[PDB]
Coordinates of C-alpha atoms and ligand atoms in Angstrom, one line a residue:
X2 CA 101.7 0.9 100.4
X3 CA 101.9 4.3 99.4
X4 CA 99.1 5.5 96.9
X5 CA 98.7 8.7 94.3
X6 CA 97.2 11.5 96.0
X7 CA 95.9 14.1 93.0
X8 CA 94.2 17.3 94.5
X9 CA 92.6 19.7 92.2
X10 CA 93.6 23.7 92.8
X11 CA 90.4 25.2 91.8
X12 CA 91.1 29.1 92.4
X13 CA 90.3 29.9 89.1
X14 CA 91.4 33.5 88.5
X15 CA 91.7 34.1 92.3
X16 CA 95.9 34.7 93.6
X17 CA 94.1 34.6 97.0
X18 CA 91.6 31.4 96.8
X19 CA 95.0 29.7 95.3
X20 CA 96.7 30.5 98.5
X21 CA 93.6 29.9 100.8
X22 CA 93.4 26.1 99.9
X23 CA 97.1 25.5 100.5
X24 CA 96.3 27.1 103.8
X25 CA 93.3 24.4 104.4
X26 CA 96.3 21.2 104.4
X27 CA 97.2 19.8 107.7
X28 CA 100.4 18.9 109.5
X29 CA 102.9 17.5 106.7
X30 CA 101.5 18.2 103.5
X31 CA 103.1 15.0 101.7
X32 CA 100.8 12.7 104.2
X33 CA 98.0 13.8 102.5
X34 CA 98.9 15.5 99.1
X35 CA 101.4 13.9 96.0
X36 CA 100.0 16.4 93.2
X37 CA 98.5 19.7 93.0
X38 CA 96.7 20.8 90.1
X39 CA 95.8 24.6 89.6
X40 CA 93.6 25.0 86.9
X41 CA 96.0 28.5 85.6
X42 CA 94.1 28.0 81.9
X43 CA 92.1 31.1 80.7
X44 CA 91.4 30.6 77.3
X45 CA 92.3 27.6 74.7
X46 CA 92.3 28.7 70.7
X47 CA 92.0 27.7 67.5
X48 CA 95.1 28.0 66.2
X49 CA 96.7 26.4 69.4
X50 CA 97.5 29.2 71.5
X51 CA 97.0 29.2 75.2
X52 CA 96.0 32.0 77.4
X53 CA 96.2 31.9 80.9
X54 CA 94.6 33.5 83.6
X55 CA 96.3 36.3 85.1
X56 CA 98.7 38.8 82.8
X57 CA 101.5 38.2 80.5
X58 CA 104.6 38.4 82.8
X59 CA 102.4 38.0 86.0
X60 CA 104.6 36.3 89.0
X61 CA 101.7 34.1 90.3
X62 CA 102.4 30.8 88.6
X63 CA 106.0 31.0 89.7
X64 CA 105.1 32.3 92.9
X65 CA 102.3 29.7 93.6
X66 CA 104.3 27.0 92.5
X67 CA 107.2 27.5 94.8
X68 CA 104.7 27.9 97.7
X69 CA 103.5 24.6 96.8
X70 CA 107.1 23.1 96.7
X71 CA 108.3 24.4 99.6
X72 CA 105.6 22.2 101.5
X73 CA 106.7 19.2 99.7
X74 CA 104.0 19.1 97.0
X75 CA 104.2 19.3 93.2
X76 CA 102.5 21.6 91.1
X77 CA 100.1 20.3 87.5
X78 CA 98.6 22.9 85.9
X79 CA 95.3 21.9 84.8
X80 CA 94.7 22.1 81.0
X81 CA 91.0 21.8 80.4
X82 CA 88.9 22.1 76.7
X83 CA 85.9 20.8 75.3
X84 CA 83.2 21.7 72.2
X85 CA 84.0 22.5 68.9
X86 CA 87.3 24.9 69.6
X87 CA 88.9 22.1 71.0
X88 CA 87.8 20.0 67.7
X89 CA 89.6 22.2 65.4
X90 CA 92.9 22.5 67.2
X91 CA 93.4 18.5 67.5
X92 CA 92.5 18.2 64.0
X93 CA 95.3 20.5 63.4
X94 CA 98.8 19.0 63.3
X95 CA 100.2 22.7 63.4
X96 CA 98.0 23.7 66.2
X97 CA 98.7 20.4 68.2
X98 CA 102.6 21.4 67.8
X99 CA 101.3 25.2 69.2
X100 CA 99.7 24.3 72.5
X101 CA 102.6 21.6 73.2
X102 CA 104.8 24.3 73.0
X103 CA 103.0 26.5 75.1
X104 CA 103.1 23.8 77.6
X105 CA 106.7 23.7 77.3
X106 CA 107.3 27.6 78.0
X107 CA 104.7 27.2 81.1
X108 CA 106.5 24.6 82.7
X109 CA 109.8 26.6 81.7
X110 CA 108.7 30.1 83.4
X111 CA 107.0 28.0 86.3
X112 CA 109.1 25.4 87.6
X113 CA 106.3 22.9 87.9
X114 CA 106.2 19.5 88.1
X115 CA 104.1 18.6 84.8
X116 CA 100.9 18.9 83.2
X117 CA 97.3 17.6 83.7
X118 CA 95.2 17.3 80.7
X119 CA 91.6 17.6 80.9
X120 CA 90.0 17.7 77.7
X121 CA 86.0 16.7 78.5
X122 CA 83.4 15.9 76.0
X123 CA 81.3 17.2 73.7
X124 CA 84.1 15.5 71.3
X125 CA 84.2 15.1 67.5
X126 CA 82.7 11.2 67.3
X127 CA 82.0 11.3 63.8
X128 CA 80.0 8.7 62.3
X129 CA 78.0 6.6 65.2
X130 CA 79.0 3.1 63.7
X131 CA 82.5 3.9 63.2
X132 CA 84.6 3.8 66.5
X133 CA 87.6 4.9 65.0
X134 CA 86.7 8.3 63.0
X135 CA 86.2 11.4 64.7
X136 CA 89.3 13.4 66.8
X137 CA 89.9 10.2 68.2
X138 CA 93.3 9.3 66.8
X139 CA 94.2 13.4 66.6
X140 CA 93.9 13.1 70.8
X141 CA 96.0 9.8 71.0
X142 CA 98.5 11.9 68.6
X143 CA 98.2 14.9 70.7
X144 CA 99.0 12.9 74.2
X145 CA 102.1 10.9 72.3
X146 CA 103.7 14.0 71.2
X147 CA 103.0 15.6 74.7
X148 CA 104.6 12.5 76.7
X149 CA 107.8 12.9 74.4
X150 CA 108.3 15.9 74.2
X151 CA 107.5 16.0 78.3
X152 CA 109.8 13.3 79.6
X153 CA 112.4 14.7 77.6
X154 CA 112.4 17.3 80.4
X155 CA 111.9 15.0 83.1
X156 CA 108.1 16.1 83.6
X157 CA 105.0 14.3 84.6
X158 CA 102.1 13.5 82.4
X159 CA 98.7 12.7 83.8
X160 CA 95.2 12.8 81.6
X161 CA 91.7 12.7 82.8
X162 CA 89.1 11.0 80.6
X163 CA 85.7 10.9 80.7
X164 CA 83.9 7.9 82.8
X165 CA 82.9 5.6 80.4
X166 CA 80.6 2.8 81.4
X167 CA 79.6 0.3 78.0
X168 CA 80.8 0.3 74.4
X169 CA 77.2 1.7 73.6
X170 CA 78.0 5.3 74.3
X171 CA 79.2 6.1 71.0
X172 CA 79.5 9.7 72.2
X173 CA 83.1 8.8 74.0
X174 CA 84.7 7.4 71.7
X175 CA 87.3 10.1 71.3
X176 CA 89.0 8.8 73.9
X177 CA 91.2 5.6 73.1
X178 CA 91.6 4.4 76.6
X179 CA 94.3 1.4 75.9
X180 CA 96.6 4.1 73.5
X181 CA 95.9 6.8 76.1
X182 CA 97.5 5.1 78.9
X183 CA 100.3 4.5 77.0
X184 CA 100.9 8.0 76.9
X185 CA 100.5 9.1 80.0
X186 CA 102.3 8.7 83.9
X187 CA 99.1 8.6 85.3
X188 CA 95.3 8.2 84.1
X189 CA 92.2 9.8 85.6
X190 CA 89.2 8.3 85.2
X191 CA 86.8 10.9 86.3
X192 CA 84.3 9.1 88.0
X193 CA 81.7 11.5 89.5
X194 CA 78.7 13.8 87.9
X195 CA 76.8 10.2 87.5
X196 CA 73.9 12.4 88.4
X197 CA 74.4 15.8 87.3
X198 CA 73.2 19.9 87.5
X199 CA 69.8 19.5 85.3
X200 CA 69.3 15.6 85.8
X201 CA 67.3 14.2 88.6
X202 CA 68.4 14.0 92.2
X203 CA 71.1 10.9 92.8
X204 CA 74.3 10.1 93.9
X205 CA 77.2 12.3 91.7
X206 CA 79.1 8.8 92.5
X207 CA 77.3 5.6 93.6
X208 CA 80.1 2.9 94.4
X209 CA 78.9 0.3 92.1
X210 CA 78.3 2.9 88.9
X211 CA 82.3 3.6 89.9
X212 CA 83.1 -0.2 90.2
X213 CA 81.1 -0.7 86.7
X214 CA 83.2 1.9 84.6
X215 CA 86.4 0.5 86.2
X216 CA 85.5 -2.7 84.8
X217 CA 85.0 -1.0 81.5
X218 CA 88.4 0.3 81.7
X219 CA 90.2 -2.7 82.4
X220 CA 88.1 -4.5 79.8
X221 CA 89.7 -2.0 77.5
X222 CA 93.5 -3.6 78.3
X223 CA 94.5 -0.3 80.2
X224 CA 97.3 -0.9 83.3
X225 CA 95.2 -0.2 86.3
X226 CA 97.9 0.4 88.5
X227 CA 98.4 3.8 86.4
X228 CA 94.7 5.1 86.8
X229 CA 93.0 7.1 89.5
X230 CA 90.1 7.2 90.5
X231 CA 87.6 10.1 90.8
X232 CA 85.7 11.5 93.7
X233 CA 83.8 14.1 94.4
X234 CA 84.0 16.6 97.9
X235 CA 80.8 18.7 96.7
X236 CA 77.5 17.4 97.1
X237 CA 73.8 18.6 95.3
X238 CA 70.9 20.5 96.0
X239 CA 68.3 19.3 93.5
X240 CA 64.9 21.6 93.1
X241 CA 62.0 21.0 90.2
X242 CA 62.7 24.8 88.7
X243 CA 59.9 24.4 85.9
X244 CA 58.9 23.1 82.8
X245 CA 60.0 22.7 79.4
X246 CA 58.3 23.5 76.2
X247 CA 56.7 19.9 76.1
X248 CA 55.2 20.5 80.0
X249 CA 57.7 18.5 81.4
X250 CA 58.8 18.5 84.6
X251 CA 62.2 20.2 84.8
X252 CA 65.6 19.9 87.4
X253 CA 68.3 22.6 88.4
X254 CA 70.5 22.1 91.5
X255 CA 73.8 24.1 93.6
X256 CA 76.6 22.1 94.5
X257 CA 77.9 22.8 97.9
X258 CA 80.2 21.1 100.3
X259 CA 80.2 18.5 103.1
X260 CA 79.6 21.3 105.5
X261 CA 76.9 23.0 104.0
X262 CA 74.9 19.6 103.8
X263 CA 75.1 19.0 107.2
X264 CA 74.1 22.7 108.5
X265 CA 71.3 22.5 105.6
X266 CA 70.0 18.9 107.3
X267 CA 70.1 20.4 111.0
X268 CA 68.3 24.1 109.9
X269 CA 65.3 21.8 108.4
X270 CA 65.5 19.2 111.1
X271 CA 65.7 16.4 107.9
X272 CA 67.2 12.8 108.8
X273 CA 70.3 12.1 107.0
X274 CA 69.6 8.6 105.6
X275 CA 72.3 6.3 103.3
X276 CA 70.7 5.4 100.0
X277 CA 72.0 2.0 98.7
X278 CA 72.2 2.2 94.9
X279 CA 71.8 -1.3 94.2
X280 CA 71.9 -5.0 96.4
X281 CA 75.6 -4.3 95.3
X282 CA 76.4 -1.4 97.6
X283 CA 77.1 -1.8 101.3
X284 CA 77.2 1.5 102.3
X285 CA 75.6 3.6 100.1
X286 CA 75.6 7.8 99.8
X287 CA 74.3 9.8 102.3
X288 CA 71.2 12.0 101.2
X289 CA 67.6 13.9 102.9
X290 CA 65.1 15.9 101.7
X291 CA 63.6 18.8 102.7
X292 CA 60.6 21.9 102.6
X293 CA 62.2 25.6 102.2
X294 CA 60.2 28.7 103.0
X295 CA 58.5 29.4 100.0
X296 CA 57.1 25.6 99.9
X297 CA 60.0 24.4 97.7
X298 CA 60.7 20.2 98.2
X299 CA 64.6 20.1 98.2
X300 CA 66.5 17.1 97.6
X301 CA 69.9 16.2 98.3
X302 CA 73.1 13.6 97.7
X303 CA 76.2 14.3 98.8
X304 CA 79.6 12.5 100.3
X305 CA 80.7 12.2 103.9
X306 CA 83.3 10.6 105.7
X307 CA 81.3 7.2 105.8
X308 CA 80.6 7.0 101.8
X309 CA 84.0 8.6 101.0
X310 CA 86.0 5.3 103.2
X311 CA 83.7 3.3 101.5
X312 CA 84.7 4.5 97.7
X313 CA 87.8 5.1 98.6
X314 CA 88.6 0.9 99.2
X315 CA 88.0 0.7 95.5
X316 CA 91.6 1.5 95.3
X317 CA 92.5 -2.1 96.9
X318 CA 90.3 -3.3 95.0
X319 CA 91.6 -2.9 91.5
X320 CA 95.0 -2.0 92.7
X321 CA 94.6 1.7 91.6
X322 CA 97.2 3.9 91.6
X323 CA 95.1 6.5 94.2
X324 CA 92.7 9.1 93.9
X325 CA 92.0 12.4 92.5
X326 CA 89.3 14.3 94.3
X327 CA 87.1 17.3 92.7
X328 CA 88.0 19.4 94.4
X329 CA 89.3 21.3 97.1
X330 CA 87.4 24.1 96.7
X331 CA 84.2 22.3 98.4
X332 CA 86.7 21.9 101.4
X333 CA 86.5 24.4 104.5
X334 CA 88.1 24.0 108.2
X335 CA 85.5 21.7 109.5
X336 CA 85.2 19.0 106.3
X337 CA 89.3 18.7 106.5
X338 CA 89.4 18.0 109.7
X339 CA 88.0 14.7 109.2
X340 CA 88.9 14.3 105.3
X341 CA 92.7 14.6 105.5
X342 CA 93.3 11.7 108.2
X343 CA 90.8 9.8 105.8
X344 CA 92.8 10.6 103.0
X345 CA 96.3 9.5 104.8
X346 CA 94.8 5.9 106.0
X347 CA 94.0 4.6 102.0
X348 CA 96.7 6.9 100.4
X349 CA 99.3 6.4 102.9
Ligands
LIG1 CA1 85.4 18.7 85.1
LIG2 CA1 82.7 7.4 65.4
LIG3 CA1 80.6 1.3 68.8
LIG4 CA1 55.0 15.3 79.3
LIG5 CL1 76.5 23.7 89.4

């Protein structure tokens, strides 16, 4: 009964916010905690190369990496690209064999554990029709080579993809889900920012908009019991901020976490109420609006315990492989307090 537990290190270029999160993990760190992965990446190029984001010869990545060992855990560096840099570099069988090798000599002067690739849309789809043009095949020939070269030196290889919902978003079709999970250990399907910074006030992930791209995923032939699921620990803070050129009404928002919410909804007095997405969602996604100072109407959706248990069954469900949360960053004292023994009753 024991499930994939995926946290995302999000301390950036911060030795001390690395260190700070490890410090936020209860009791035995394997009951709630499989993977870690620090996102060490400071620049991607053209030609391949990768830059991370402390010195040359700095002693953090080794340094980090045993700390994370030493309390059981292993350590996948986060890889993340997107836009047109990232374009070039698949397109280029010489720049694909570049980063792979930089991969290489990273887990070599690092120890860790493997590598998680997160390379996010906007993506080369090339002609709308055609579902097979585009960088499409260059990323399935990028992850192949990686997972060879990788499990050559006994290393794991997880990939998160975007969340796609129907064949008519054109705009994904970089990612050939059925080849991909071929390729990998473990595939994330990043299921959160269904409502995002500049959109209009929602849920970031309503239960059955994650239940719906699942389906999706499956339909695509992919073995479920290699994908994880996504989550998210921050919450949003949607204002109207103006208009555009046309007059129209325009959004902009600060993520925050559980905590924040909660303080925010007690400071304004505001009742925290569940919204239901649909007749197809039980428990829903906490949410409350409220009046600043200056006569601002605030609105906002976030994740607590309740809506988190709820998400989190999806897992039985489909017979997921677990989870992996973004991230932990959005999680102080008081939200683990309550989060971790939550994440130790599905994940086991
Ligand atoms: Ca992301
Ligand atoms: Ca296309
Ligand atoms: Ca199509
Ligand atoms: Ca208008
Ligand atoms: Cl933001």
């Amino acid at each position: 009964n024991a499930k994939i537990s995926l946290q995302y290190w999000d301390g950036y270029a911060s030795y001390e916010t690395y260190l700070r999160q490890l410090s936020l993990i209860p009791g035995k760190a394997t009951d709630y905690v499989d993977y870690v992965s620090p996102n060490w990446r400071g620049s991607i190029g053209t030609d391949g190369s990768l830059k991370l984001v402390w010195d040359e010869g700095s002693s953090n990545y080794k340094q980090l990496t045993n700390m994370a060992h030493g309390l059981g855990m292993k350590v996948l560096p986060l890889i993340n690209g997107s836009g047109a840099t990232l374009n070039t570099l698949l397109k280029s069988p010489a720049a694909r064999e570049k980063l792979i090798g930089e991969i290489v000599v990273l887990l070599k002067n690092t120890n860790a554990d493997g590598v998680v690739i997160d390379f996010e849309t906007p993506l080369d789809y090339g002609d709308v029709k055609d579902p097979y043009d585009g960088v499409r095949n260059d990323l399935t020939a990028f992850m192949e080579s990686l997972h060879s070269e990788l499990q050559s030196m006994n290393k794991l290889v997880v990939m998160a993809v975007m969340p796609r919902m129907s064949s008519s978003q054109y705009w994904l079709d970089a990612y050939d889900y059925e080849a991909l999970s071929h390729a990998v250990d473990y595939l994330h399907v990043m299921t959160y920012d269904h409502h995002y910074r500049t959109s209009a006030p929602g849920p970031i992930a309503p239960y059955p908009w994650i239940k719906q791209v699942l389906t999706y995923i499956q339909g695509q032939g992919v073995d479920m019991s290699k994908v994880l699921m996504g989550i998210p620990y921050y919450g949003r803070d949607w204002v109207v901020d103006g208009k555009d050129a046309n007059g129209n009404p325009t959004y902009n928002s600060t993520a925050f976490g559980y905590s924040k919410a909660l303080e925010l909804a007690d400071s304004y007095g505001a009742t925290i109420t569940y919204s239901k997405y649909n007749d197809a969602d039980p428990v829903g996604t906490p949410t409350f609006k409220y009046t600043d100072e200056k006569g601002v109407e605030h609105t906002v959706f976030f994740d607590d315990y309740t809506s988190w248990n709820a998400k989190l069954s999806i897992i039985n469900e489909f017979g997921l492989a677990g989870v992996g949360p973004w991230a932990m960053g959005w999680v102080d004292e008081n939200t683990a307090e309550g989060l971790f023994p939550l994440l130790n009753q599905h994940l086991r």
